[PDB]
Each structure stands twice: as C-alpha cells, then as structure tokens.
Write a protein that binds this DNA or RNA. Structure first.
Lengths: 113, 48, 59, 100
RNA sequence: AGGGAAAGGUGAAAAGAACCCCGGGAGGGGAGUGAAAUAGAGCCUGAAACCGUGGGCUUACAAGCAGUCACGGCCCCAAGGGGUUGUGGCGUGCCUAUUGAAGCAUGAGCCGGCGACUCACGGUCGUGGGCGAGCUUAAGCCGUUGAGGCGGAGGCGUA
RNA sequence: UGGGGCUAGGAGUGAAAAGCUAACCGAGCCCGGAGAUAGCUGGUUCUCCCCGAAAUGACUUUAGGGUCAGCCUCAGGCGC
RNA sequence: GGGAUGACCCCAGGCGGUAGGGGAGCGUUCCCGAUGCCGAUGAAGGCCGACCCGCGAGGGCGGCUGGAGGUAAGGGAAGUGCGAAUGCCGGCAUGAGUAACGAUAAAGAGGGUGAGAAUCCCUCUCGCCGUAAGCCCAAGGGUUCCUACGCAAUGGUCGUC
C-alpha cells in the first residue's frame, strides 16, 4: 500500500523544482518536513504542500499509520509552457517561455512483520 | 524623433472620408470594391 | 546575435555532465534544547529561544 | 413544420434496451430534442437544489427523456404503426385494425 | 488604396463526480455515475521529436564518422536464443557540385505533416483488337435516368 | 513657431545633394497584365534483373547554349 | 539438351558500374466484383516479437491497445511512395540556469493587514526636482475617473497593490 499526491500545472520550471524533490527522495516523513523547512528555495513551498496532502491521504484514506511513513518515490514531470513576448533593440522581439510543472509524491510504510 | 503619424481628425475626415470618396470617380470605385468584398467599414472608423 | 557563436548543438551527454556538480545540499540541523524541535545551529528559533535573551511568547 | 411525430399525451410501450417492455403513460413530449418521458429511466444526479431556499434537492430525482423512437403506442393488445382516417368531417388516427 | 490568419470530435444518455479528506486557491486522495473515467471536460484514437522515475549490463592510464568481425565475462527462458560490452582485428559522415571532396567547397538543429514530368489538341513510332479495298462517322435527333440506337456533311486511303 | 490651405510619380518641390516626396527614391506605394522572361543556381520521393556512354569534329552575335555527325540502348530483318 | 514442353530435371557459359536505354515486381487512394463477404466472441488505426513466406520492395502469424468500421479472387482509374530545395506549416531541442531586469535622485526602522509581505497601508528619520521632475489650457486618447469584491493572467521580482 502506498499513498499518492500529484500537484498539476504549478508554474515554476521543472529543472528548478526537481532540485529540491531529489533532496527528500527516500526519507522518513519526519525528516522531509525539516529538510523542506530549512531548504531555501521557491520550490520548497510547492513540494511541502504536496508532501503533506500525500500523508493526510495515507493516514485518513488507506489507514496506514503516521509513524511508519516514508517517501517511497517522487518525481516532477513537465506541463505546457506559457509563451510571452520580449521586445528588443531595432524593434526585434524575442519569445520568452514561462515553464510549468506537475509535482508527484508517494508514501509507503517501513517494514511490516 | 518626431515620427510619421500625427493624428488630426479634421484632416482624416477630409482626406479619406465618405463624402470625399464619392466626389471623385476613383474614390467611388474604392467603395464599390470594398462593398463587394464584405468589409464592415467602407471608410476609416472615426467618431468621438 | 553577434560575433562569437556555438559551432554545434551540445549533446545530451555533455549537457548532463556539466551538471554533475549542480547537486544540492540538505540544511544542517540540531535538536532545539529546552524544547522538542529541530533548529539550525547558532540561531534563535520560535518554538523556544534562549536565556538572557528575547523570543516568541510568554503569558 | 416537419418537426411533428409518432406519439403524444397518452399510453405507450418501450422496446428499447435497458427498460425493454414496460408500459407507462403520457410522454411529456419535447420535441426540439426528439424524446419522451414515460415513467422509465431514472437516475440520481447528485444535488444541493437550484437555491437551498426550501433547502436540498433530494436523492431519487426524476425521469430521463429517452429517444422518441424507442417508444411504441398501443391499443386493445400492443403496438401497431398508426394509420390515418378521414371521419367524413374532421381527422383522427386509427391503429392498424382497431381504433385511436 | 490595400493586405489578411489561426481555431472541428466526452458519452447511447450529463448520468458533468453529492458527501468526506489535505490545500488561500489550483490541484489531488476516498466515495459515486458509466459497458469503458490513462472516455473527467480545448475530454475519441493518441505516432515522433523532446523531459522524467525505476530496473539489468557497463565505465575514472585513455585516442574517437562511433560501427563491424572474433573471442571472453555478467543478466533474463534452455545443449538454443535475447540484452550488455572487456580485449583484439578492420574502417576518411549524407547530399550536391565536380578533372578531383572526410574534406577547411554547397545545403541541412531534430521530429511530424505539405512539397516537383501533368492535362488538351495535333503529330510520329510501337502495340492489343475490329473490319478490310475499304475503314470511320461530326454537330445533331430519338431513347435511357449510371442502356443505348440513329445521324455519311465531312476525313483518311484507292496514282 | 501653432492653426487653416495648394502643388505628385518622367510629375511636384529643391539657397542644387540626383536632396526630399509616410523608418532603403538615378524615378513612391497598392492592385492588376502575371504563373513576365531567367541559354543561370538549387531540388526531384518504392524494389529487383540485363546492357551501358561522352568530355571529339563541322557551322553557330558561337565560345559554361545549340544543330548534324561520332560513341550507349531496344525492336525487326540479314547470316561468317 | 531432354523433347509424352514437365515452365520440371540435366550440362555449359555470363552477372563491377555514373549520364542514359530496356525488363520485371511491391505498396498508397478511389471504381466494378457488392441487395455480397468479414465484423462487438472486436473493423480501421496504434505498440511489441528471437516465429513463418518472399532475392527485395513487401506479406502472414501471435500478444497487448482500440471501439465501428473493413472489403478477396480477377480487373479499371490516378492529387500514388521524400532526407536534402538558405524549401512551406507546426511542435520540441542547443546555447543556459548563461546576457539581461530600461538612466548612479538613496535609502532605514517601528507599527498594521494577511494563508502568504524588501515590494500594500500608517508613522518617524534620510535623499532628489523646484523658468520643474510644480500648477492651468489646447491637441490627440476614449472610461483609464470614483467605489465594493478579487489576483489566473498583464506588471521585466514579489504583490494582500
């Protein structure tokens, strides 16, 4: 049994958010919270949010038990970009792409027997 | 620097207006072409 | 748009190879004494605080 | 205007699918959408009412339209295509070998 | 004056997800509808480039148009295959243009889709048939309503 | 210097540079003639089988283009 | 060469190839075959295979996906096969977490408010303009004025503004 999260369309670039997801991959639920607490990045807030909703779901929905929980796996995939114009000299005009993310977390229960 | 568009409403109406276009046979043809095309404005959009 | 410019598309492999050192660091933490919590050392932190010093609340 | 069709405010049998063979009355006809009513299809569409003045919507709901070709009108027996008769003054519709 | 785009598709039926749970929301996780919900709403099918996670083999005294041939090791169903590659042998990209190009000569970031020897009327060889010292109809007229007939003005040929 | 007017495309205007005439004027912009023409440059898409050249001569307002000859190919006939 | 021509057996030669000439095939769309044949016990299309048949282009077979179409034998038409055209349309890469964030007049703290504040409100310090970076009209613009609820986007960061 595992619990699943998934936050879609978040509005931040994958390459940047991944940086902090790779931090907590495979750790007790307890440590993760503190890693994120004191990790100093915009993506903290986003990943924290998705890490909690996942664990609520474990306890509440699949009766899994808070204390046993850990990050079984996590990953962040890319969504569709927001295209925007940036005027230049000699009126030349480039296109800037505001990138976007789908963040995923899944918890498991450590040991059993 | 000062550029090419220097808007003046009297000027525009006297130059590209309806009454203007109907005075000259060439201006008459403009409309006739425009209408047959199904333009929604025969003359430049000007009011207040 | 001007003088110097890349000769070739940088290959996926050499892209990622640049990034070997881009890896991150976990923040360094100690257990808040005089209270059950984690906190980064040499810091005052608001579940707790200090002694001959300022902090959150006391009623 | 070519809109007009088969049945009206009266008794009919189903020959459809899910509710095959049924009998129910008046169809409360559309017909812009080509359908009927009967007492047939019911579904519970989950609710809270249009405005919770006289509060909530309830949980058994109403009848579904049902495609107008799935019904088949009936008299002293079963279905029969409708036929038409002059009256020698007005106009009405007789079932094939029977009446109305 | 004038120029001039892009952009179609849930499901038989909205039955378009009440209620609960984390979140400011957006999203999700349970529940429920449905034959089907990776049919959940710029929703049929969903190919390729491109970006991730997990697993097997593999690499920090090497040197290369990136492959091929041969041994050898490991990993997965069995005297045989598949995946990977340690060492050894051999090896100057594709296209165009050219007397001559790996060429330091032209073109191309990569993937998908669009993209260039046609038709009419004359002509000339060849060829499968019809009829033959002859062969053949045009416009039109009559029928059919995916039926075919008639129509020698004319044309080629017989010096 | 503000406001109101007039002059235009082989035409205007010019204390004269071939300057200016709506961000490129030794002849404006738009649409049409029009799919101008281009002896020049580029490109031309599935598979197997058999044969397989030329870069010479003559003439050519010809010389990196052509027309005839020569050399490749297929069909019919002739037969050392 | 057999010659019961069997297109099958025996023998002997030929088979590098650009411009070109000639010969065979494979596949795509559509028509007759069709009031038919296959089809929800799964059409077309999609994804996999070390299997079978073809010299090859190709064609079968099996497993998963898909949910309503497909169309033999034998023939007939053509918008019929792409890798290149500084080709056209669209999508996604590289440079890269790189250069930039638009006047060198300049900031600091304390209180509010809020899920969230360097970036909003208030106060106190500091700096800049003052024939202006102040005030009043004309043109041009067309609701940007004022207020209450808001923050997905627009704002070169943030945003409760």
């Amino acid at each position: 049994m595992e619990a699943k999260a998934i936050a879609r369309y978040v509005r931040i670039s994958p390459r940047k958010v991944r940086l902090v997801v790779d931090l907590i991959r495979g750790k007790s639920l307890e440590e993760a919270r503190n890693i994120l607490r004191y990790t100093n990045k915009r993506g903290a807030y986003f990943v924290a949010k998705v890490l909690e909703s996942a664990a609520a779901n474990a306890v509440n929905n699949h009766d899994m038990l808070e204390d046993r929980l850990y990050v079984k796996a996590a990953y962040v995939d890319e969504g569709p970009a927001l295209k925007r114009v940036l005027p230049r000299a000699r009126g030349r005009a480039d296109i800037i792409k505001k990138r976007t993310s789908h963040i995923t977390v899944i918890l498991g229960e450590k040991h059993g027997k | 620097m000062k550029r090419t568009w220097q808007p003046n409403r009297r000027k525009r109406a006297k130059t590209h207006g309806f009454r203007a276009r109907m005075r000259t046979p060439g201006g008459r043809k403009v409309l006739k072409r425009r209408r047959q095309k199904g333009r929604w404005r025969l003359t430049p959009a000007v009011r207040k | 748009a001007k003088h110097p410019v890349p000769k070739k598309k940088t290959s996926k492999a050499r892209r990622d190879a640049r990034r070997s050192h881009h890896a991150l660091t976990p923040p360094t933490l100690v257990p808040c004494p005089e209270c059950k919590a984690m906190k980064p050392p040499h810091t005052v932190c608001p579940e707790c605080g200090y002694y001959a010093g300022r902090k959150v609340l006391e009623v | 205007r070519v809109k007009m069709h088969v049945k009206k405010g009266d008794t009919v049998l189903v020959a459809s699918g899910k509710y095959k063979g049924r009998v129910g009355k008046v169809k409360e006809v559309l017909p812009k959408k080509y359908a009927v009513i009967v007492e047939g299809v019911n579904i519970v569409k989950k609710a809270v009412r249009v405005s919770p003045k006289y509060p909530q919507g309830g949980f058994i709901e109403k009848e579904a339209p049902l495609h107008a070709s799935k019904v088949r009108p009936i008299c002293p027996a079963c279905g029969k295509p409708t036929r038409v008769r002059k009256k020698f003054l007005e106009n009405g519709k007789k079932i094939r070998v029977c009446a109305k």
